[PDB]
Structures are given as structure tokens and as C-alpha cells.
Amino acid sequence: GQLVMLRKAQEFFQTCDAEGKGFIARKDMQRLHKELPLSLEELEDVFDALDADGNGYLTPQEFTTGFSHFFFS
């Protein structure tokens, strides 16, 4: 089951990091408000939930790890 997860984490990591940086910043999570139906307020909550180490920087492994906790409940 883990391969299907990773295929989605890549898809969704790419979607947030549309600029090709190699990580998701606190401002990629804001421009999602225009594409997804959530308040900016929720988006930063998401962000905050996902940055385990508090860099203010979302890495693929941090992104993939979060999605995997979710994918499996």
C-alpha cells in the first residue's frame, strides 16, 4: 500500500511547490486558498502541523510523512 501513498505525496508536493524550489514555504501554503477551499487560517494550521522541526520550511519527507499518517487511518 505504500507505493500508492508516495505517488500521491509526490503529486501533492508538486502542487504546493509549483515553483520548483524543492520545499514548501509558508507562502506556497497561502496561494492554495485560491485553489482549495480552506481559509488561510486553516492553511497555516496545515503548514504548522506538517513542519515537524519548525524550520518554517516544508520538506518532501516532512510532506510525505504527514500524508502517510493520514493515508493510513
Partner: peptide, 13 residues
């Protein structure tokens, strides 16, 4: 944890 579900569930549509 629910706001992650929201955010992921939304990404899935």
C-alpha cells in the same frame, strides 16, 4: 489532524 484531513481530502478532489 482534521485540518490535515480537510486539506488532503480537498487535494483529492
Amino acid at each position: 489532524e482534521g485540518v490535515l484531513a480537510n486539506f488532503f481530502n480537498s487535494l483529492l478532489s
